[PDB]
Amino acid sequence: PYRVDFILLEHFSMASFTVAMDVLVTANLLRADSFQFTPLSLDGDRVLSDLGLELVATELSAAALKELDLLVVCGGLRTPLKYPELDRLLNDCAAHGMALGGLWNGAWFLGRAGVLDDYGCSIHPEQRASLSERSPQTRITPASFTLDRDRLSAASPNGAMELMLGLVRRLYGDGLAEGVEEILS
């Protein structure tokens, strides 16, 4: 069971998050227990999305990240660029051997944390300039998603759907991913 958790930041792109989840759930629909996932919050059991809706989430536990294969930072247009704690948290997750990710502008955070050094990534245009300024060793891919080793990132909802399809393809084959796509699309 590939374990992936999503850190939902305030004003996170709901469409980015829900489409990525759809892919992982639909994958399970055709192939049992392929993925285990959990929405996570840095502070609280509720996170507000860019749609005004709040989602219930588990309060992140530095310890309970240990059993993870992938930690994804979910941001959005109005997502505040703070959360200084994410820097050592992601660095340690990177040291531990975890794959790391970001939707919409989550790559900005992976960038500041120094975990995209000599890696490609996708990020929303609004934060492209800052990401390059803070992380010179990070390359900006001229496309909506990026699958570079253990660094997965997307700049848009569609990029996020392709990103998780890329993940499904890399783990269980073109067969499952192609099947997942048929249902969703």
Added chain:
Amino acid sequence: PYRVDFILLEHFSMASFTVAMDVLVTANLLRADSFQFTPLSLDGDRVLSDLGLELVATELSAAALKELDLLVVCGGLRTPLKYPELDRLLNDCAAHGMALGGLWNGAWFLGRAGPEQRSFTLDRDRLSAASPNGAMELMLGLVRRLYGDGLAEGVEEILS
């Protein structure tokens, strides 16, 4: 501001419900105070979506259904075909002319009045949709009607 409220039933289609909300929030981005909305629950302040995620909602209230210009029934595949209160309450809302709608198979509950056979359709003041994509056009038509093709076309360019 036009008022639309969504009743989220257990296992409701998240994708279906979210894209609908996207159209409205987006319209508000292009034209302030265009819409107002609230997710509603028959029991508890939390509802399990079809994706395993739970959204915080507001428990349904009759006295509240006074400033509502539209009410929608959001359902999903594994959603149970029950909820008795959906007869008195729906008919009561129709008893006020109030607009009513349904997403995915939330039209079935509409059938207790007027593959769950029983993508979208806008019939006078009774809206419907049987797919996430149908939910999009559904709310786009709502905008096209209450505000025109201009604002409606603008929203369509953003979501995609």
